Amino acid sequence: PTPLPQLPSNVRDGENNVASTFLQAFFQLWDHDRLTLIPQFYDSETTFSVVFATDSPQDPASSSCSKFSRNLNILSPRHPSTLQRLFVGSNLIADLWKVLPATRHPSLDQTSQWLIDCHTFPHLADPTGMAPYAMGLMINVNGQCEEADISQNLYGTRTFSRCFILGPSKPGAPHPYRVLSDQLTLHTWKPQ
Amino acid sequence: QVNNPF
Amino acid sequence: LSRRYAAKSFVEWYYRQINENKPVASGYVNNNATYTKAGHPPADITINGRVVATPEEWDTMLKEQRASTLPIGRKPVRYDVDCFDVHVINADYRFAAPQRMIEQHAPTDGVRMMMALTVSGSVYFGASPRSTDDYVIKQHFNDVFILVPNWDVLEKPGARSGRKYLIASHKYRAY
């Protein structure tokens, strides 16, 4: 058997290059000022999930997520996150983002360090109600980042996937588009 | 007439 | 809740077909009667960064991947799913929808769902059928799908077989 050929990032995000503009802003702010992304691109309807594809020892994100889940049960015992397995809205997303480990992503300039595939797709709902449909933008990222382990105060290496669904924003939004869906998959974490 | 910001 | 059952059922079906050397093209919108009449665009498929025109070609690529150079008792290719997650990105999906499905199912009924599905796991090349350690090559894979309702199957009385939700978009990455 021969594994499928591997090609570089396939970026088909249309005329306005939103995938470039968004991702440039996102990973810059994710490292340095994470929570400011929320008012810029997220709203009351945005859905976020973190899932783990492996069981790395001393996984720092796993620890922080477990602490978050514990604290949520203490403060909001009948929150639907238990069975829904996702977090909805700027407010709750912000609380989780606060405890997820600090990170350092490579520059988007290092093309070989990133696998970014995106395309525009039809038949989202129009949040303005003016049209029957809206166009969406799917952006899937596979890459690596430095991810902090506070127990040692050292950065480890995290392999991750992150899938964004972007769509037109609600009226009065800071940008013409918003994040509808943000799915983060954390794979291997290795100490450096 | 799709709402397309992209 | 509904989205999770739909995702679980799809994931179980899709990777079972691949692992049993069966086609997955029937899981895409392209060969659907209602979406075809409605003029749905072809499923948007990207495989390791290559845009693939049809689900049929993707099935052929899967065949070619599994083709040996292998000793007896080895399975050429095996996908093991480690996790998946699903979000509804349009709870009021209406494209090509029978009018009755719009009237009978509000966005809160969990039927007219457009879903963003992400799946991750490992691909084992040349491993014994149940082994995760005697492979020749091991890849990590990450699949993402946009799923839409199959209007021809959903609440179709007497429909036992069939896909309740179909693939409108698919991106595959393995490395």
> Which CATH number characterizes residue A91's domain?
3.10.450.50
Amino acid letter for position C6:
A
Can you tell me the distance from the alpha carbon of A7 to that of C172, in angstroms, rounded to the nearest whole number?
11
Contact A135 B6 (CB under 8 A): yes
Contact A4 C61 (CB under 8 A): yes
Can you tell me the distance from the alpha carbon of C124 to that of C122, in angstroms, rounded to the nearest whole number?
6
Residue from A101, A100, A98, A96 nearest A156 by CA: A101
The alpha carbon dihedral of C60, C61, C66, C68 has a sign of positive
Can you tell me the distance from the alpha carbon of A46 to that of C61, in angstroms, rounded to the nearest whole number?
36
Q: How far apart are the first and last CA of chain B?
A: 14
Can you tell me the distance from the alpha carbon of C29 to that of C114, in angstroms, rounded to the nearest whole number?
13
Residue C141: give the domain boundaries: 1-175
- Residue A168 main-chain phi, psi, to 5 deg: -65, 145
Amino acid letter for position C4:
R
Residue from A104, A159, A137, A188 nearest A20 by CA: A137
Q: Within a 10 A sphere around the Cβ of C18, how many other Cβ atoms?
A: 18
Q: Within a 10 A sphere around the Cβ of C16, how many other Cβ atoms?
A: 12
Amino acid letter for position A10:
N
Half-sphere exposure of A101 (CA within 13 A, CB side): 27
Query: What resolution (Å)?
Result: 1.8
Contact C49 A6 (CB under 8 A): yes
Can you tell me the distance from the alpha carbon of A126 to that of A172, in angstroms, rounded to the nearest whole number?
14
Please tell me which residue of chain B has the smallest CA distance to A118.
B6
Across C69-94, b (16+ Cβ under 10 Å) vs e yields eeeeebbbbbbebbbbbbbbbbbbbb
Element (H, E) at A138: strand A134-149
Contacts 24+ apart (CB under 8 A), C16-24: C18/C62, C18/C77, C18/C79, C19/C78, C19/C79, C21/C63, C21/C66, C23/C56, C23/C59, C24/C55, C24/C58, C24/C59, C24/C62
The alpha carbon dihedral of A80, A85, A88, A91 has a sign of positive
Can you tell me the distance from the alpha carbon of C130 to that of A170, in angstroms, rounded to the nearest whole number?
49
CA angle A180, A189, C79 (to 5 degrees): 70
Q: What is the crossing angle of helices A90-99 and A60-75, to 10°? A: 130
The alpha carbon dihedral of C107, C7, C44, A138 has a sign of positive
Helix (H/G/I), strand (E/B), else coil: C70: coil
Across A29-51, b (16+ Cβ under 10 Å) vs e yields bbeeebeebbeebbbebbbbbbb
How was it solved?
X-ray
Maximum Cα–Cα distance across chain B: 14
Can you tell me the distance from the alpha carbon of A75 to that of C12, in angstroms, rounded to the nearest whole number?
36
Residue from A179, A111, A169 nearest A143 by CA: A111
Helix (H/G/I), strand (E/B), else coil: C35: helix
Strand-pair partners of C113: none
Q: 């991947």: which residue's tokens?
A: C65
Can you tell me the distance from the alpha carbon of C134 to that of A124, in angstroms, rounded to the nearest whole number?
45
Q: Which residues contact A91 (CB under 8 A, 6 or more apart)?
A: none
Q: How far apart are the first and last CA of chain C?
A: 32
Helix (H/G/I), strand (E/B), else coil: A159: strand
A→C contacts (Cβ < 8 Å), by residue, are 1-10, 12, 47, 49, 51-54, 83-86, 115, 117, 119, 121-125, 132-133, 136, 138, 140, 142, 159, 161, 163, 165, 167, 180-181, 183, 185, 187
Amino acid letter for position C33:
A
| Gaps in chain C after residue (C–N beyond 2.5 Å) | 67
CA C57 vs CA A59, A112, C23, C146: distances in Å: 39, 27, 10, 19
- Residue C146 main-chain phi, psi, to 5 deg: -105, 120
Three-state SS string across A49-117, please?
Answer: EEEECCCCCCCHHHHHHHHHHHHHHHHCCCCCHHHHCCEECHHHHHHHHHHCCCEECCCCCCHHHEEEE
Residue A18: give the domain boundaries: 1-192
Q: Which residues contact A53 (CB under 8 A, 6 or more apart)?
A: A161, A185, A186, A187, C82, C83, C120, C121, C140
A169 touches chain B (CB under 8 A): yes
Q: How many helices (H) and strands (E) does chain B have?
A: 0, 0
- Do strands C137-149 and C50-52 pair parallel, antiparallel, or not at all (unpaired)? unpaired
User: SS3 helix, strand, coil % of chain C, rounded to 5?
Assistant: 25, 35, 40
Q: Within a 10 A sphere around the Cβ of C157, how many other Cβ atoms?
A: 4
Number of structural domains chain C divides into = 1
Q: Is the CB of residue A1 less than 8 Å from the CB of residue C68? A: yes
Number of structural domains chain A divides into = 1
Q: Is the CB of residue A51 less than 8 Å from the CB of residue C85? A: yes
Can you tell me the distance from the alpha carbon of A175 to that of A21, in angstroms, rounded to the nearest whole number?
11
Can you tell me the distance from the alpha carbon of A120 to that of A109, in angstroms, rounded to the nearest whole number?
23
A139 touches chain B (CB under 8 A): no
